[PDB]
Design a binder for this molecule. Structure first.
Ligand SMILES: Cc1cc2nc3c(=O)[nH]c(=O)nc-3n(C[C@H](O)[C@H](O)[C@H](O)COP(=O)(O)O)c2cc1C
Ligand SMILES: Cc1cc2nc3c(=O)[nH]c(=O)nc-3n(C[C@H](O)[C@H](O)[C@H](O)COP(=O)(O)O)c2cc1C
Ligand SMILES: Cc1cc2nc3c(=O)[nH]c(=O)nc-3n(C[C@H](O)[C@H](O)[C@H](O)COP(=O)(O)O)c2cc1C
Ligand SMILES: Cc1cc2nc3c(=O)[nH]c(=O)nc-3n(C[C@H](O)[C@H](O)[C@H](O)COP(=O)(O)O)c2cc1C
Ligand SMILES: [Cl-]
Ligand SMILES: [Cl-]
Ligand SMILES: [Cl-]
Ligand SMILES: [Cl-]
Ligand SMILES: [Cl-]
Ligand SMILES: [Cl-]
Ligand SMILES: [Cl-]
Ligand SMILES: [Cl-]
Ligand SMILES: [Fe+3]
Ligand SMILES: [Fe+3]
Ligand SMILES: [Tb+3]
Ligand SMILES: [Tb+3]
Ligand SMILES: [Tb+3]
Ligand SMILES: [Tb+3]
Ligand SMILES: [Tb+3]
Ligand SMILES: [Tb+3]
Ligand SMILES: [Tb+3]
Lengths: 400, 408, 402, 403
């Protein structure tokens, strides 16, 4: 396939893949993504940093051939860099190794085992283990490896301060534009917020630790393994610092499910009370919405509301999927215990709301109240929802 | 709307609604359903047994008017019977009451409160609280009520047209089917019995012990031999009542087939490869297999197959120390359904792939135990399974299948 | 239900409904919408302009009661204004009329018939047929009607507030009521989608109605545009300007590529065409019919200078999914905007083919200028993919030349 | 992967793939399918008939190895048979050829070109072009090729016909035979397969049947082993079904398809159904907002009438109808020898026109359009009675049509 490489610095090219058609990746919705791979041309050696998903190498090979042609060099890779084991960045490693068998493969110690487990043809490949720190001179260009998850590492092109961070600072976006400044800021920052919410939230304590143990001024560009390349590294570093420390807006994310609309009516009434205080509201209906967009909004919300009816003594089963996700994400690790209210309608003994409150506490939320009612809410019951929402909104505005 | 009533007995008509277009109802998938309502013409009183979902009364009114015209009676209802509070059978009660305000509403004590909570316009309506074995004479036709608490709600009851042995069982014995055909014998048996199995699995499973109790009470009173027809609130009318009674007795007592239901989720296909390998080992023993991929399948079909499976396999990869979140939904459903209530602890295996510390499979095993399953083993592997690892899955599947065949 | 009204001017409130949960409306995808209704407090009469979708009136009543309370007035509506017949704006009319039976209902002659057909309980309601340029004095506040079929605009003369119903609306559901309170990119993209899906076939009418209003001088009197969905425009020229651009066919150096596939060959061709287009610095939007839908596709076609459509051949015809998009494009009539967007038809086949020829023919019927067709046998070779790249490159050169 | 082969006859095994997880294939919905491949052990040569979809060969290799072990033979394929070029049956051909490069590949002349186009590694492979009624001996077992790029392979001694797609069904069960699953499931899947894939070939099927009957080869068929689903131990059951579908044998049934934006067309569709039902005629109702083309055409296949409704949007019918119309234009239901009856309907709010477009497209698709009914906004009680009256008349015409 004929595909053009994109020059990002003198002798440095983006030779990645545009996955236009993917809509879902590990239960994270998207409108396509990119598998960013980079080609570094040293005076003596040519290095390929990461690659792409199995079966999507056609664009990558085309761009590698195009970059080599533009540089007046032969179609050849001398050094292979594998910052991560995950198949979206290592899927083409067996074919890259088969084509250039003498090119050493730079990766972490644990990554050798993971790579061979994914691709048995790599047994006996020339792996060059990176233990904490390792450097390679390509002739006028130096690549320094920083072992960071154990399977991962960062690659720094030292002379120009270009950090190949792999997943970190990534965003799932698929555009013809390669840089951060070429797309609308809102699209970039919202995609960055979604990527942090779904993939970095449980690592928030480490993000804070690493940042303090690195203060960063030398980083001129952040080239991640997904989406846009940051020509303004401080913009994403700053965003990460805010998310990791729990800097939120006067906003509440309301999530609910319903069978006959009573819990839905309660959710809308809570929102009215919150809005009367000028606090922002994001409303999610589990029958139509999904977990990745919900957690993106929870990330900068000072409060979270969860409602569901009772069905055979348990809350409606859809809450189970979000609860399991929140249990893995650990939002309390951002250093903030977001406020929460549990609610729902019931027709007999109830119990769904009590289960919700208990699970919200386990997920790191500060549960302030619970509100369970019988069948259809009356006007007075809806006013109670409004009053509870209003009081919560007052508390949200009072939080640091 | 012009809609014809269907005569089911002398002076008895089906005046129900065909919900052709509904595809999902309280997280239960279907290809339409019916809200079965019945009109009983006595010499003195006309009784309406149940009604329909809010906003779907047009077909119902058309059929009621057609039945009244056929019987040379005035368009009038004298008795309203509300077997259940649930809006798919009570949704038209406010408009039925507004039209005929003198007609008493027969229901249970708990039902009065539930109905008024759903429809405030019913405050002050003529409710008539009824208890088991109490009766009303319509003139040559008798309606006998039987409280069916927690079948499937506490405010539930059954109405029996005693002279013809027609049991208006509301949700019990129902099936979510929407056909032009009204009777059990008019459609393929496999479609009828599979829809009946799905309805039991999703709505009657936690009530299994209560089903066995209500049955022994109905037998001791000599009422079972008197039932000539079962007219439920959804699907087909049973002209063979023993067929569905027998099916319910089997599901409530845990009568299963030499069958395994395998459910899994995957991000990179490794857990999927494991699931396929377990299936191969099970099949080598002649045991049946039903395979569900949580990325495309849903909870109602899964539990339909669990109902007559002696074993259940659940697999998912590890994501941030937890199993893939889609399992959370199925686990929460299984926690409510309580398959142990059938009198049987189905066998189970937990499995999955991981890339670091793992832990997903341990969570799965723990949750399966909480759901009443007898967890026999756990199998967690690193990334892509090797040929040897897939043979281990096949061997584990083979051993489980041997145990399945050994169970009663 | 308790719900707060939002004051938009002195004695003027938004008493609308936030439909948080709707995800699809007449085959148009969205993340909720609003049914904007307005309450105008005159010294003598209180007027309600439009209402909401059947079954969603709880928020509306709450906001009306809240606005009445804030104004120190009784819970009373004296005048009902029905700008449009469509149920998303008239659904609560039977209950508004039942509550205030003496309040006249202001609407066009054709609207009366349309409203009674929707709601039989309105037979005998006090309808007040309005002619164009007819006014009502509420006491210090004047409402002027402009018949634009059963649809009309209401102008609150004193403050220049134009209640435009669907025109200038956007399907957005936020706590924020004004255009300036949300990111411009979100507002303008939602406005582009609304124009693409609902105003495109009316482009010639948009141009004529604008040309007259400018020479007449009405446009300079508009200080605010309060539509029936989404954000209220505090900057009316921003949306008027956007409409003028869409109506005249002002496009970007961009190509929208739409395709479907059974075995991946047409998909490979589509990606190769995109590579050739990109080599010329031209923008590309890629849509796969197995996962994507018509409302987002047409939003991108609106500002694209070219459109590519590809599908394999199945029983002498193109893959059936194209039929849906073609039927939509036939009704939207993009050719009318004043420009004929460039187009290429493509696909893979395994026997006699013919799908690509059908595609080219339908693209021509939809008003596109079809430059070429490319049909190949089964899996594309490296040379065939380079041909796609070359065709996409040449098309991109032509796009930049327009 | 370890996977067991299934013995179908002495020295004949099913070595296919169970695609448990597939839910959609070329716009045809399903709950998994199978890619049936067969291993024939002769005294001298071992033949593999068809294979599987690319990337799904693990089960296939496991079943081939298991069959060879059970036969006390070495893991070896001496003959490769390729009945079709389609990747769901030829996807593993490059790896089968790489493993056994000396094994000739039997296929049609056109098949060679198609296979090499799909898999460039096959350039120079030992292809053996086969023409009609040509045979090969495996040692006590004979394989006869029947040209249909597609073809049929007949194991002559036991009368086993490897029909490839013909007589196939998209079903994925542990059970391999027709008699081991409920008849309704089998016959409904067979009806869906005919509707979506054989309908435009109806006249050719009738020709190819009369030719197989004249030769007296039909009475020789003891088993039909297709490339998808169940193996027919009762070949006449599926042959009979095919004869009925190809000749237009239908039930007193009507398929109603509609789309709506505000529910008015939906109310009309329900009212037409009420009138049809008052005549004892069967009804299948499809809402295009939730349903899809493959199930719709399955029911059209044995319906004597078809109703299509949609509102008017910018002078055109709701766009979802365009997809079904394009599908029906390819399927050519008039090829069954019957012009099914049809009514076009819809609601509108201005000038209308959607119903006229519907009627025109239904005629193009081979339907006999009897009437059109377009109304303004919400139907009144009287308008719903008119739908009911029209449905009743159509139903009377349906009952009057004979086979
Ligand atoms: C299948 C089913 C199971 C139910 N189980 C219970 C239960 O265990 N306890 C209870 O109090 N109510 C139960 N109910 C009643 C619901 O909780 C009641 O309808 C509730 O108000 C629904 O709220 P929603 O309108 O938000 O769905 C059940 C209802 C259904 C349909
Ligand atoms: C978002 C994400 C989170 C993960 N979290 C964990 C984890 O917490 N522990 C672990 O051992 N592996 C983790 N992994 C690695 C996966 O478990 C590994 O890829 C596994 O083999 C996936 O199985 P599958 O192929 O069935 O999806 C994670 C992978 C991803 C993509
Ligand atoms: C159900 C079906 C019907 C087909 N009909 C035709 C046809 O009428 N004419 C033709 O030339 N090819 C036909 N083909 C072959 C396809 O056009 C061929 O596989 C094409 O390359 C598919 O393109 P894709 O890979 O983009 O799906 C058909 C294929 C299938 C599966
Ligand atoms: C986007 C849109 C476009 C429309 N275009 C037309 C039209 O061109 N001609 C017409 O008579 N009515 C038109 N209408 C009105 C609809 O046809 C009318 O609401 C119809 O009764 C809807 O039927 P349904 O309730 O079955 O969707 C349109 C409505 C919408 C929302
Ligand atoms: Cl490999
Ligand atoms: Cl309170
Ligand atoms: Cl009420
Ligand atoms: Cl218990
Ligand atoms: Cl009304
Ligand atoms: Cl060329
Ligand atoms: Cl190949
Ligand atoms: Cl023809
Ligand atoms: Fe119920
Ligand atoms: Fe095929
Ligand atoms: Tb990644
Ligand atoms: Tb009580
Ligand atoms: Tb029910
Ligand atoms: Tb509107
Ligand atoms: Tb040729
Ligand atoms: Tb096939
Ligand atoms: Tb016109």
């Amino acid at each position: 396939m004929k595909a053009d490489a994109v020059k990002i610095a003198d002798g440095v090219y983006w030779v990645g893949v545009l996955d236009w058609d993917i809509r879902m990746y590990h239960g994270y919705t998207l409108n396509g993504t990119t598998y960013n791979a980079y080609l570094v041309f040293g005076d003596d050696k040519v290095a390929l940093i990461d690659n792409t998903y199995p079966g999507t190498s056609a664009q990558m090979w085309g761009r590698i051939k195009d970059a080599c042609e533009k540089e007046g060099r032969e179609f050849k890779i001398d050094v292979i860099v594998q910052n991560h084991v995950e198949k979206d960045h290592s899927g083409a490693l067996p074919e890259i190794h088969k084509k250039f068998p003498e090119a050493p493969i730079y990766c972490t110690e644990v990554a050798v085992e993971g790579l061979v487990k994914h691709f048995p043809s790599l047994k006996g490949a020339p792996f060059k283990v990176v233990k904490s720190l390792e450097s390679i001179d390509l002739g006028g260009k130096t690549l320094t490896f920083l072992e960071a998850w154990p399977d991962s590492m960062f690659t720094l092109y030292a002379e120009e301060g270009i950090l190949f961070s792999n997943d970190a600072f990534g965003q799932h976006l698929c555009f013809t534009q390669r840089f951060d400044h070429e797309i609308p800021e809102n699209i970039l920052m919202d995609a960055n917020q979604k990527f942090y919410a779904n993939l970095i939230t449980p690592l928030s304590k480490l993000v804070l630790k690493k940042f303090k143990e690195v203060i960063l001024e030398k980083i001129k560009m952040i080239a991640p393994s997904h989406g846009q390349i940051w020509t303004d590294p401080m913009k994403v570093i700053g965003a990460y610092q805010d998310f990791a420390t729990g800097k939120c807006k006067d906003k509440v994310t309301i999530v609910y499910d319903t069978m006959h609309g009573s819990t839905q009516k309660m959710a809308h009434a809570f929102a009215e009370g919150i809005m009367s205080e000028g606090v922002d509201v994001k409303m999610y209906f589990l029958h139509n919405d999904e977990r990745s967009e919900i957690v993106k909004d929870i990330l900068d919300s000072k409060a979270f509301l969860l409602g569901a009816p009772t069905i055979y003594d348990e809350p409606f089963p859809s809450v189970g999927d979000l609860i399991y996700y929140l249990k893995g994400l650990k939002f309390n690790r951002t250093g903030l215990k977001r406020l929460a209210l549990a609610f729902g309608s019931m027709g007999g003994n109830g119990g769904g709301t009590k289960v919700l409150a208990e699970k919200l506490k386990e997920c790191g939320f500060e549960v302030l109240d619970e509100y369970e009612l019988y069948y259809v809410p009356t006007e007075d019951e809806l006013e109670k929802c409004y009053n509870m929402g209003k009081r919560l909104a007052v508390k949200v505005k009072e939080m640091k």
